[PDB]
């Protein structure tokens, strides 16, 4: 999908494992939203046409372009009742933003309730004509993009026990009977090197990713190019994205591509949680290859390519702004808490209350879930390792100066990305960013069912500069009036 494109949103009855069709939310006709691409600095004009009719899900919609900074285009970011009011059925809205200096692997998904778990999700790649990693691969195209998703047999409409089927490129098996399901085939040729862009479109579990008999060389992490680091296995979290170069150097043949979920049926019995890596000329056949070898990816081992300074001073507590975020709960699942306040979405989108003249955070809503950050400042965020939550910051990436699983602080060359697991009981994951982006920017667990429960806070960054920095098209202006009239 192009730079100026339409993108109808519509239900359709999909049956990705062969077990039984279900009514889902999607873009166009596919269980994986259609790949979108451009180039660095391109200007996207993405006409979303809401055409939804299944009243058992949500029929409104709002799309987020994950990992794009949206500087000057905060109204386009996508979060429901943060940056916009939802688009109504029988209406449309053109998200129009630029991607100045960002090439890499992103994705896009609904950001209204848990509606992306009913289907609205897919890949977004921004190529770099001048990419420093070009020499490390012969192939990078629509065929080298690899999506993982957790699929639900029942409409979204809690903390659901777990997903039902792991789909790779929208395909995979389940145990109604695994044989009911197709396997996704990623095709390669001997001697060729491939930039696979691996996209977790997941609403919840993390996956342990691997390619039987093959090594993976990491060059890119959540949009950002890193020094080439070679591994055999990988855990990818909700919303995360890695590029890995895979050389087809083993014996011509079939090989399992593995994706072990953190929740739901795990393991590979029957070929669940799998896909096929097949060589030109191999038999059209089911793999029989055995899984992985030692060298797992450790986040603490990735280094950003182009010289990044973990902003600020190299002491924890050394940023200009140090906030410590602690997570609280609630029995069932409808009230998560951070520093004693759940995220409860207001009727007035936080961008709206601000543009309107509500500048003191104290008066913003919801109460306490919103923190104002001052401009051109260095921020240190710590989140006491709760229970494996993949936290995601909008409008920015960050240096994770303390990686899940390592008592050290690294201000020298920490990983930079935009989704990070807080690990659990033992961890104190901390990162740092710079508030150079006037905007109300979300920070939430990317476990979709946790955000729906209130696990989230809104960063109202450079409040004085938001109306000025952001130029608001009349079409943004009537989302809320047309939504608030609904029925
Ligand atoms: Cu996302
Ligand atoms: Cu995002
Ligand atoms: Cu979570
Ligand atoms: Cu978000």
């Amino acid at each position: 999908a192009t730079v100026a494109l339409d993108l109808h949103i519509l239900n359709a009855n999909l049956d990705p494992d062969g077990t039984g069709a279900r009514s889902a939310v999607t873009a166009e006709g596919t269980t994986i939203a259609p790949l979108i691409t451009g180039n660095i600095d391109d200007r996207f004009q993405i006409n979303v046409i809401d055409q939804l009719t299944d009243a058992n899900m949500r029929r409104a919609t709002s799309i987020h372009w994950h990992g794009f900074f949206q500087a000057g285009t905060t109204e386009m970011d996508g979060p429901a009742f943060v940056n916009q009011c939802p688009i109504i059925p029988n209406e449309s809205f053109v998200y129009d933003f630029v991607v100045p200096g960002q090439a890499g692997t992103y994705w896009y998904h609904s950001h209204l309730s848990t509606q992306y778990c009913d289907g609205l999700r897919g890949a977004f790649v921004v190529y770099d004509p001048n990419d420093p990693h070009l020499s490390l691969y012969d192939v990078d195209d629509a065929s080298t993009v690899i999506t993982i998703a957790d699929w639900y047999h029942s409409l979204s409409t809690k903390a659901p026990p777990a997903p039902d089927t792991t789909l790779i490129n929208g395909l995979g098996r389940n145990s109604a009977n695994p044989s009911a399901g197709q396997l996704a085939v990623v095709s390669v040729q001997s001697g060729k090197r491939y930039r696979f862009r691996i996209v977790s479109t997941s609403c919840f579990p993390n996956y342990a990713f691997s390619i039987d008999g093959h090594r993976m060389t990491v060059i890119e992490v959540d949009g950002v190019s890193h020094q080439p680091l070679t591994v055999d296995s990988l855990t990818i979290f909700a919303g995360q994205r890695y590029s890995v170069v895979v050389e087809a150097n083993q014996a011509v043949g079939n090989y399992w591509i593995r994706a072990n979920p953190s929740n739901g049926r795990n393991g590979f019995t029957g070929g669940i949680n799998s896909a096929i890596f097949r060589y030109q000329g191999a038999a059209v056949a089911e793999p029989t290859t055995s899984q992985n070898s030692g060298t797992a990816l450790n986040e603490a081992n990735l280094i950003p390519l182009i010289n990044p300074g973990a902003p600020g001073n190299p002491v924890p507590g050394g940023a200009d702004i140090n906030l410590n975020l602690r997570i609280g709960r609630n029995a069932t699942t409808a009230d998560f808490t951070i520093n004693g306040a759940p995220f409860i979405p207001p009727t007035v989108p936080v961008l709206l209350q601000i543009l309107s003249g509500v500048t003191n955070p104290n008066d913003l809503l919801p109460g306490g879930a919103v923190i104002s950050l001052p401009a051109n400042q260095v921020i240190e965020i710590s989140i006491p390792g709760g229970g494996n939550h993949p936290f995601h910051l909008h409008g920015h990436n960050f240096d994770v100066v303390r990686t899940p699983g390592s008592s050290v602080y690294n201000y020298v060359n920490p990983v930079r990305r935009d989704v990070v697991s807080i690990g659990g009981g033992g961890d104190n994951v901390t990162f740092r960013f710079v508030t150079d982006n006037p905007g109300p920017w979300f920070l939430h667990c990317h476990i979709d069912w946790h955000l729906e429960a209130g696990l989230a806070v809104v960063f109202a960054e450079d409040i004085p500069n938001i109306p000025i920095a952001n130029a608001i098209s009349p079409a943004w202006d009537d989302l809320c009036p047309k939504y608030n009239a609904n029925n």
Side-chain angles (χ1 to χ4, degrees):
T2 337
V3 129
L5 202 86
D6 286 314
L7 275 163
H8 313 258
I9 302 320
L10 44 300
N11 308 282
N13 302 108
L14 310 158
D15 9 52
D17 56 30
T19 257
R22 88 145 247 212
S23 267
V25 188
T26 4
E28 297 297 329
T30 306
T31 226
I32 321 231
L35 174 75
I36 285 189
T37 62
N39 291 339
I40 181 178
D41 188 10
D42 269 13
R43 177 195 201 199
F44 292 94
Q45 272 186 79
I46 293 145
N47 200 207
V48 160
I49 300 187
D50 181 343
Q51 297 194 283
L52 290 174
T53 62
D54 191 339
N56 288 304
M57 275 166 283
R58 253 227 177 241
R59 281 179 281 162
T61 200
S62 176
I63 311 231
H64 171 50
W65 325 97
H66 181 128
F68 288 138
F69 298 149
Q70 302 282 180
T73 48
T74 202
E75 87 276 7
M76 302 297 179
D77 196 48
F81 322 110
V82 184
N83 311 75
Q84 81 168 252
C85 277
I87 319 162
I88 289 318
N90 274 22
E91 313 274 327
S92 84
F93 175 88
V94 63
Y95 291 76
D96 173 332
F97 66 98
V98 284
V99 188
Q102 322 189 232
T105 308
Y106 299 91
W107 58 301
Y108 65 98
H109 51 90
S110 160
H111 216 255
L112 152 79
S113 200
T114 350
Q115 154 197 71
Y116 103 66
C117 313
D118 300 320
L120 204 24
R121 33 177 176 177
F124 201 126
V125 167
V126 176
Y127 292 104
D128 189 358
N130 320 220
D131 190 315
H133 285 324
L134 272 185
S135 67
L136 296 163
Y137 50 86
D138 313 289
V139 174
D140 187 36
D141 67 24
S143 73
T144 64
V145 174
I146 293 174
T147 67
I148 318 316
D150 51 344
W151 181 264
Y152 300 78
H153 284 182
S154 153
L155 321 182
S156 59
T157 240
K158 244 14 150 120
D164 278 292
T165 306
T166 304
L167 313 165
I168 322 259
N169 290 350
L171 278 156
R173 296 184 177 180
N174 200 345
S175 223
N177 70 316
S179 82
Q182 196 221 331
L183 293 156
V185 193
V186 171
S187 281
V188 314
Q189 308 210 355
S190 292
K192 278 158 149 76
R193 296 126 75 241
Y194 300 68
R195 190 186 174 140
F196 285 118
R197 302 147 178 282
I198 306 183
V199 189
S200 176
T201 64
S202 167
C203 264
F204 177 14
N206 60 260
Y207 309 91
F209 192 83
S210 68
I211 307 178
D212 280 30
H214 300 79
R215 287 205 241 167
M216 304 194 287
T217 311
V218 191
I219 65 188
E220 186 222 332
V221 197
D222 294 4
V224 192
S225 305
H226 285 241
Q227 318 183 169
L229 197 90
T230 286
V231 303
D232 357 37
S233 76
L234 252 175
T235 308
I236 185 150
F237 291 100
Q240 290 194 329
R241 296 105 48 217
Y242 292 100
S243 257
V244 296
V245 166
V246 194
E247 181 169 3
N249 68 332
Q250 296 322 126
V252 181
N254 292 115
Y255 295 89
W256 279 129
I257 301 167
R258 322 217 171 233
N260 220 182
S262 61
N263 188 18
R265 188 159 160 218
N266 297 174
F268 310 114
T269 311
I272 70 159
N273 299 315
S274 311
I276 302 145
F277 193 76
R278 150 181 319 172
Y279 277 65
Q280 172 172 236
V284 188
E286 286 252 318
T288 24
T289 38
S290 82
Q291 160 198 103
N292 76 4
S293 342
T295 286
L297 167 129
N298 170 316
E299 234 151 32
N301 283 344
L302 302 159
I303 292 148
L305 191 69
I306 294 166
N307 277 353
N313 310 300
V315 56
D320 295 302
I321 284 123
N322 141 351
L323 322 331
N324 183 236
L325 320 199
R326 188 200 206 121
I327 283 203
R329 304 192 93 202
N330 156 313
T332 14
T333 267
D335 190 342
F336 253 112
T337 336
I338 291 162
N339 289 9
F343 187 85
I344 99 214
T347 74
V348 207
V350 185
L351 224 187
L352 193 46
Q353 342 176 19
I354 313 174
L355 288 170
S356 316
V358 175
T359 99
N360 189 15
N362 139 258
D363 316 328
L364 280 168
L365 292 162
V370 174
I371 319 145
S372 81
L373 299 183
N376 293 331
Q377 282 289 14
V378 298
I379 312 331
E380 192 171 82
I381 289 325
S382 52
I383 336 215
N388 294 302
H389 305 265
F391 266 72
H392 168 51
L393 153 67
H394 290 224
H396 302 265
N397 37 8
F398 46 67
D399 308 77
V400 193
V401 163
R402 156 158 208 188
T403 287
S406 130
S407 319
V408 230
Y409 288 69
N410 193 0
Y411 294 104
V412 158
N413 41 25
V415 221
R416 202 176 143 159
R417 31 179 338 148
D418 60 29
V419 170
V420 88
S421 172
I422 309 195
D427 280 313
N428 211 349
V429 172
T430 321
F431 58 84
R432 299 220 172 155
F433 51 110
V434 197
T435 55
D436 56 10
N437 202 356
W441 300 122
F442 236 164
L443 188 96
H444 51 87
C445 181
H446 219 297
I447 280 170
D448 216 26
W449 315 103
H450 285 172
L451 159 78
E452 188 66 355
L455 189 36
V457 304
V458 186
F459 279 138
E461 177 194 340
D462 203 336
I463 293 168
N465 284 256
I466 286 146
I468 306 173
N470 306 90
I472 283 236
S473 224
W476 188 90
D477 276 326
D478 354 344
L479 317 148
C480 306
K482 257 191 163 175
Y483 176 83
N484 267 299
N486 265 6
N487 284 57

mmCIF file of all heavy atoms in Angstrom, residues 64 66 107 109 392 446, ligand 1:
data_model
loop_
_atom_site.group_PDB
_atom_site.id
_atom_site.type_symbol
_atom_site.label_atom_id
_atom_site.label_comp_id
_atom_site.label_asym_id
_atom_site.label_seq_id
_atom_site.Cartn_x
_atom_site.Cartn_y
_atom_site.Cartn_z
ATOM 1 N N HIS A 64 -3.359 3.891 14.631
ATOM 2 C CA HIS A 64 -2.052 4.339 15.064
ATOM 3 C C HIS A 64 -0.981 3.734 14.149
ATOM 4 O O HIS A 64 -1.005 2.554 13.802
ATOM 5 C CB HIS A 64 -1.767 3.980 16.528
ATOM 6 C CG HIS A 64 -0.375 4.214 17.016
ATOM 7 N ND1 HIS A 64 0.297 5.403 16.846
ATOM 8 C CD2 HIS A 64 0.487 3.420 17.708
ATOM 9 C CE1 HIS A 64 1.494 5.344 17.393
ATOM 10 N NE2 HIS A 64 1.645 4.136 17.901
ATOM 11 N N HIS A 66 2.595 2.954 14.426
ATOM 12 C CA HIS A 66 3.413 2.618 15.582
ATOM 13 C C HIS A 66 4.883 2.885 15.255
ATOM 14 O O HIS A 66 5.454 2.394 14.289
ATOM 15 C CB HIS A 66 3.246 1.177 16.053
ATOM 16 C CG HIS A 66 4.018 0.712 17.254
ATOM 17 N ND1 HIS A 66 3.374 0.092 18.318
ATOM 18 C CD2 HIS A 66 5.320 0.696 17.624
ATOM 19 C CE1 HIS A 66 4.255 -0.244 19.243
ATOM 20 N NE2 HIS A 66 5.446 0.130 18.845
ATOM 21 N N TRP A 107 4.608 -0.744 12.295
ATOM 22 C CA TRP A 107 3.377 -1.466 11.890
ATOM 23 C C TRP A 107 2.189 -0.534 12.110
ATOM 24 O O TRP A 107 2.457 0.602 12.488
ATOM 25 C CB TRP A 107 3.319 -2.772 12.633
ATOM 26 C CG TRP A 107 3.335 -2.746 14.117
ATOM 27 C CD1 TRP A 107 4.269 -2.230 14.964
ATOM 28 C CD2 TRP A 107 2.295 -3.304 14.935
ATOM 29 N NE1 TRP A 107 3.877 -2.433 16.265
ATOM 30 C CE2 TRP A 107 2.667 -3.089 16.267
ATOM 31 C CE3 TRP A 107 1.094 -3.956 14.619
ATOM 32 C CZ2 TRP A 107 1.863 -3.514 17.324
ATOM 33 C CZ3 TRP A 107 0.314 -4.370 15.681
ATOM 34 C CH2 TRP A 107 0.688 -4.155 17.011
ATOM 35 N N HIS A 109 -2.099 -0.231 13.609
ATOM 36 C CA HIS A 109 -3.162 -1.048 14.195
ATOM 37 C C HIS A 109 -4.222 -0.158 14.817
ATOM 38 O O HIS A 109 -3.943 1.017 15.123
ATOM 39 C CB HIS A 109 -2.608 -2.007 15.247
ATOM 40 C CG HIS A 109 -1.754 -1.306 16.264
ATOM 41 N ND1 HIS A 109 -2.321 -0.788 17.434
ATOM 42 C CD2 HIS A 109 -0.444 -1.022 16.340
ATOM 43 C CE1 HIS A 109 -1.369 -0.232 18.158
ATOM 44 N NE2 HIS A 109 -0.214 -0.354 17.517
ATOM 45 N N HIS A 392 5.388 0.776 25.958
ATOM 46 C CA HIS A 392 5.615 1.451 24.688
ATOM 47 C C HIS A 392 5.427 2.951 24.812
ATOM 48 O O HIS A 392 4.383 3.359 25.317
ATOM 49 C CB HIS A 392 4.642 0.848 23.657
ATOM 50 C CG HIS A 392 4.557 1.621 22.392
ATOM 51 N ND1 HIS A 392 5.687 1.999 21.682
ATOM 52 C CD2 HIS A 392 3.515 2.105 21.691
ATOM 53 C CE1 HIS A 392 5.319 2.682 20.599
ATOM 54 N NE2 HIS A 392 4.018 2.754 20.593
ATOM 55 N N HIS A 446 1.855 -2.511 26.072
ATOM 56 C CA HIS A 446 1.398 -2.944 24.773
ATOM 57 C C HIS A 446 0.690 -4.291 24.754
ATOM 58 O O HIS A 446 0.341 -4.755 23.661
ATOM 59 C CB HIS A 446 2.543 -3.036 23.738
ATOM 60 C CG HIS A 446 2.047 -2.539 22.412
ATOM 61 N ND1 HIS A 446 1.031 -3.158 21.709
ATOM 62 C CD2 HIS A 446 2.403 -1.451 21.689
ATOM 63 C CE1 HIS A 446 0.796 -2.482 20.597
ATOM 64 N NE2 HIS A 446 1.617 -1.443 20.558
HETATM 65 CU CU1 LIG B 1 1.600 -0.243 18.647
#
